[PDB]
Amino acid sequence: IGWIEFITGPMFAGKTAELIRRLHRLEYADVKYLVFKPKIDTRSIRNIQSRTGTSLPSVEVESAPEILNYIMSNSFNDETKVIGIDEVQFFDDRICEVANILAENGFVVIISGLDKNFKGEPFGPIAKLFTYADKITKLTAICNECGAEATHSLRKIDGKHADYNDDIVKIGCQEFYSAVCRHHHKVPNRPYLNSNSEEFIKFFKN
Amino acid sequence: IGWIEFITGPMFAGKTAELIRRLHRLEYADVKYLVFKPKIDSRTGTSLPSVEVESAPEILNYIMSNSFNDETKVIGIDEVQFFDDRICEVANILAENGFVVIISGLDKNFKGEPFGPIAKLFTYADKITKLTAICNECGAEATHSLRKIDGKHADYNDDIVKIGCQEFYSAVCRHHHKVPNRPYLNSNSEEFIKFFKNK
Amino acid sequence: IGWIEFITGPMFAGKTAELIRRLHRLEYADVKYLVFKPKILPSVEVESAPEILNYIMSNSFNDETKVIGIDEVQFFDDRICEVANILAENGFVVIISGLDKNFKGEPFGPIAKLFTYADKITKLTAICNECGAEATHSLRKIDGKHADYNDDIVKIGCQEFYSAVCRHHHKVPNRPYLNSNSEEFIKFF
Amino acid sequence: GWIEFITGPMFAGKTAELIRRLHRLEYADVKYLVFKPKSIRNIQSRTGTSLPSVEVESAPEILNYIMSNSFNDETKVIGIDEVQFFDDRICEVANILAENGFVVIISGLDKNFKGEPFGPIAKLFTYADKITKLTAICNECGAEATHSLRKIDGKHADYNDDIVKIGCQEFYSAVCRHHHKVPNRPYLNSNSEEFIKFFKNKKR
Ligand SMILES: Cc1cn([C@H]2C[C@H](O)[C@@H](CO)O2)c(=O)[nH]c1=O
Ligand SMILES: Cc1cn([C@H]2C[C@H](O)[C@@H](CO)O2)c(=O)[nH]c1=O
Ligand SMILES: Cc1cn([C@H]2C[C@H](O)[C@@H](CO)O2)c(=O)[nH]c1=O
Ligand SMILES: Cc1cn([C@H]2C[C@H](O)[C@@H](CO)O2)c(=O)[nH]c1=O
Ligand SMILES: [Zn+2]
Ligand SMILES: [Zn+2]
Ligand SMILES: [Zn+2]
Ligand SMILES: [Zn+2]
């Protein structure tokens, strides 16, 4: 039938390039595809920057269910069998049901997005997406500090690491973000929820 | 140094075999490992001797105890889906403190939904291997575990924890996983299915 | 430590795009690289595989460079294997891209050995021009007609001569069988 | 049909992985058949997992067996272990099976003790739809191991030694590239020796 492919990893891993690669191969077989992207609510963005440059044509949607409405609309080409989704982490939980129904109905769904927000925690609905994806490709970047495989995105404001309670959404590139390995990802004021965690950390440092 | 590998997929995909395979390689290089499993009520082969723990934090307590050999820097964890949320913090802390953590567990419960705390482990895992079984119906790659009782597919609202093997469970592809009374959260979902149904 | 990464698959699989992706990763981390190509996307053209080691030894080479890219590797001879292994042994990361099969479906030049020496292998798929399944083979056609087994290996070109196909849609007239029971088995089936 | 190739050094779990892939079929009631070159009745991993197998002297005998009354017509999957012991003819056999609707899952060593391609396997990489290069753990440094090292009386095996030698930990270990050393390894390119010597000196 259909299925879900999920492309993930930190910033600077080339996630979007990988999505473009997968769509370009469809073009040589003349297989039709359609790409969607979430439109962030700019009222919920702390500081808006105006920029429109993009490497990949996609239809902006305000919410995940609007993908299904678009497919039901006159704008949709009925021969389209592949649905691409970029920057998926900006959707809410509603994307999971959408992607599943698409896959259950004969579509190949190719999804790209960040696995972790700046805190190193799951970004929005992507945790559940991992579970539903038939195929996962977790890409790596290169650690800006040591050059090892980078698995994390680190936000720095004026050289200072971002605090745990800072805003999830902050749009930007190298001016705010670097790719780092686990070892070089530090988040000030990260809490511990287990009762014996800080005891263990103290124990192993002696 | 220190990272997490996650081995996942439906029942009958050989997850435990893959965990065994990964850990067994260590024995030739004299690298010690220790396996943990949650408290849970064959062909030829040796199973992993493993410490039974009632909760994820008990893993760290064990490591700090006189029972743990401090030369051990590889930690195995099987049936991870039976843990609660606290497993993620345990795994991350181990990885941050020089341990290699190799984890196996089901990605989906019988409803086709994320099993326990599993979804978060995908994000925290450096390496993910999603294994496939073989669909009991069509032979394609199987991605889901299906529960039947007396021939009938288990209803959506049945209990999640139900221990057993082939008497209740089979592996199926997406198309052959059906859950009676599965709810739709999005208001346009059933509209779309009916719309697309018409050819 | 050094190593070899190998990107492969048929035409229209996006091999070059994947090579580009991996090198672009390096730029964000301030890691310098250098790409080489055989004679007939920025690269240094070399007439043979050992010339890569000569260029590196020359003073036109940036001493900072720790990553070596090699595109269209199937056009080199077997000498590329030693060169690649030498670089890996001497601290370089070598990222190689090339076709795994020629139009006949047989190993393209030196790549068979390269597979063995590579630490990491990524075999990419294209989309079959005939059925849309995963494509693993490159098919040549000259005038609607499939290329004969004994046609020339090197023939530079794009869609005017070539397509991606799955194994089932890859057909080569006059393909010989070297095993005595192969035709006996095929007739049986 | 199609071809899957499982490879990498000794102690990587290759046979264990073949067994895993084939065991999956049993729960779905899918028949398979395992072949091995040359326990004689089965293939086994080093943790005691095992499957029955037919042993063959050569690749063409696989097709002969499949054409005989001993072959179950329901068989969809063909497994082949220790493939490095076959000759070049294994490629054609594997291709023909894949072309005739069989899934062929193949396991074997990629490199001999010299670090060179083991027998016919270089071509199998090309013909295999799916490649799984497994790693062992370096006996020296604990890094991912990619090579098999042979030792004779505690000393590394010479380049000109016999390729075929049956044995486990008595002779063989798994090592990373850096810890794989073979005395009297020849340089085939006329500028390779001058490169190493130049580059080593560049650390001045
Ligand atoms: C890691 C991270 C990235 N981003 C943004 C930066 C980029 O604009 C975009 C990734 O392409 O997501 C966030 O908004 N929050 C985060 O926590
Ligand atoms: C799929 C599934 C498995 N299981 C059990 C059955 C097996 O005993 C165990 C997996 O080894 O998990 C559940 O309890 N609930 C479920 O939804
Ligand atoms: C498949 C095939 C491609 N090619 C060429 C076509 C393209 O120019 C190049 C692939 O990028 O290789 C051959 O020369 N011979 C072949 O058999
Ligand atoms: C590396 C190597 C292994 N072997 C053997 C040892 C093992 O019995 C078998 C691999 O399982 O192959 C050789 O015969 N020659 C070699 O060069
Ligand atoms: Zn780092
Ligand atoms: Zn099915
Ligand atoms: Zn086809
Ligand atoms: Zn080593």
Give one word for D190, left, alpha or beta, with left for phi > 0 and alpha for psi -120 to 50. Answer: alpha
| Mutual angle of helices C15-28 and A15-28, in 10-degree steps | 170
How open is the CA angle A168-A174-A176, to the nearest 5 degrees? 35
One-character DSSP codes across D45-57: -TTS-EEE-EEES
What order of strands is seen across the sheet that includes strand C44-46? C44-46, C33-38, C67-70, C93-97, C3-8, C120-123
Residue B8 contacts residue B144 (beta carbons within 8 Å): no
Angstrom distance (rounded) from CA C156 to CA B118: 50
Instruction: Among 3.40.50.720, 3.30.1360.30, 3.90.1150.10, 3.30.60.20, name the CATH number for the domain at B132-199.
Output: 3.30.60.20
Instruction: Write the CATH number of the domain with boundaries D135-204.
Output: 3.30.60.20
Which one, of D183, D199, D201, lies nearest residue D191 by Cα?
D199
Elucidation technique: X-ray
Rg of the Cα trace of chain A? Answer: 19
Residues of each domain in chain A carrying CATH 3.30.60.20? 140-206
Which one, of A110, A23, A9, lies nearest residue C17 by Cα?
A23
Residues of each domain in chain C carrying CATH 3.40.50.300? 1-124
Resolution (A): 2.0
Instruction: Write the CATH number of the domain with boundaries C1-124.
Output: 3.40.50.300
Residue reference for tokens 């042993």 = D55
Candidates C138, C185, C186, C188, partner chain D, best to mutate (most D CBs within 10 A): C185
Instruction: Among 3.90.580.10, 3.30.429.10, 3.40.50.300, 3.40.190.80, name the CATH number for the domain at B1-131.
Output: 3.40.50.300
Class of domain A140-206: alpha beta
Residue C118 contacts residue C88 (beta carbons within 8 Å): no
Other residues' Cβ atoms within 10 Å of the Cβ of residue D100:
14
Of A14, A25, A147, the CB nearest to C24: A14
Nearest CA to ligand 4 atom 5: D166
Instruction: Write the CATH number of the domain with boundaries C125-189.
Output: 3.30.60.20
Class of domain D1-134: alpha beta
| Mutual angle of helices B189-197 and A94-104, in 10-degree steps | 10
| Contacting subunits of A (3+ beta carbon pairs below 8 A) | B, C
Residues of each domain in chain D carrying CATH 3.30.60.20? 135-204
| Mutual angle of helices D14-27 and B15-24, in 10-degree steps | 170
Question: Which of chain C's residues have a Cβ under 8 Å away from the Cβ of D125?
Answer: 100, 112, 115-116, 121
Is domain A1-139 given the CATH code 3.40.30.10 in the classification? no
Question: Element (H or E) spanning A28, and its range?
Answer: helix A15-28
Q: Indicate which residues of D carry an active-site annotation.
A: 82
Rg of the Cα trace of chain D? Answer: 19
Catalytic residue (one of B5, B52, B58, B79) = B79
Angstrom distance (rounded) from CA C11 to CA C100: 10
Of all ligands present, the nearest one to the C-alpha of A114 is: 1
What are the helix and strand counts (H, E) for chain A? 5, 11
